[PDB]
Symmetry: C3
Subunit: 159 residues, 3 copies
């Protein structure tokens, strides 16, 4: 059994005038994450952890701005494509764990919807997908609500 681990990181600024989308879930809130597309910090971190575990580089190498098929794709579509490319390299996904660091808003009521989005997109049972939520105890830009961070870890195995 040829197991591999991957880890992922993402951060985006938290600004008025964009929706707040994390884990494929749109969360009603006065601000949203700034970046390309939906700036879904959680799905990007997971996407990188999966590419990382398959040793397939990173999210930036896979999906560019000029990409004719993936310009106009949201972060769930990128995740589904990532899962396909991980399978192409010979790996089946075993589990995902993650942490969202956000001072606000409260994320607890939206976690299980995030897990269901991720589980569906990866064709995993719900109980192989975990998402945890943290504040930053008012420390740094995260503590001041200037951005939201996601951290992810993934376990795969070669078929």
């Amino acid at each position: 059994m040829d197991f591999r681990i991957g880890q992922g990181y993402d951060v985006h600024q938290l600004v008025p005038g964009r929706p707040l989308i994390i884990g494929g879930v749109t969360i009603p809130y006065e601000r949203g994450l700034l970046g390309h597309s939906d700036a879904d910090v959680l799905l990007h971190a997971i996407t990188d952890a999966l590419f990382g575990a398959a040793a397939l580089g990173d999210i930036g190498r896979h999906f560019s701005d000029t990409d004719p098929r993936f310009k106009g794709a949201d972060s769930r579509a990128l995740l589904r494509e990532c899962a396909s490319r991980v399978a192409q390299a010979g790996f089946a996904i075993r589990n995902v764990d993650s942490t969202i660091i956000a001072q606000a808003p409260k994320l607890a009521p939206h976690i299980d919807a995030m897990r269901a989005n991720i589980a569906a997109d990866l064709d995993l049972p719900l109980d192989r997908v975990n998402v945890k939520a943290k504040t930053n105890e008012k420390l740094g830009y995260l503590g001041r609500g200037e951005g939201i961070e996601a951290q992810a870890a993934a376990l795969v195995v070669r078929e």
Copy 2:
């Protein structure tokens, strides 16, 4: 061979008039970590990694940060209950690794005592538990002594 990985993150402010308890070790210092519990940043991150690997949510959902029973709570007891919930869910713990980021004080002399506490609490041999120490090179709120961070990784197996 049903292996799972979890990862954990925690940070707490460093303030005067608090005990400095990391990995269950009371460390002499002019300041201590601030929280609802004893604010043991390391144990909390490990606890989160273990809940994450078993896909049981997070430390927030299991133990409320606004509940008199948990005020000043011994984080080793929270870690021991976590281990119990991980077992009941059908997993055995294989290893824990972790990092504490603190600019001060020196943590190296206390590392082995931390490992001893964690190993006892998780009923693990010492050689499956690791704790590492880092400063933040005087960068950010961590580099300025305003808080302490912990990171953790945990490998479990469904048994």
Copy 3:
């Protein structure tokens, strides 16, 4: 079947005068990482992940002596030796570099090769990823550069 996971972290200040060395690769830039050796943030993070996985402490505990003055690729090979000595084989390494500037993409494959050579691993078991910090905090301002690592080992 006795698998173990390890995780690593490192950060270093970005300063004028110093060469920028990440993953053993000298990258043209007006600033470089401040530290004892070449202050190779990436290699230190991977080194820590490896000691962590084998439960052998950390980089600072191993190289607190002779290893004062060593470059990070030397420390990494030595780390691998001590990990092998302890009875563990390395299965894979993954890592992320967080740097606002410069562009790291053109240098990633070369870092990969350096790490794989140093760990005596095939290229397809070593991975390096690049991130910016979206202009946030000391990382976003180019005050420093961070690396994260994760490692899987098996006790032989």
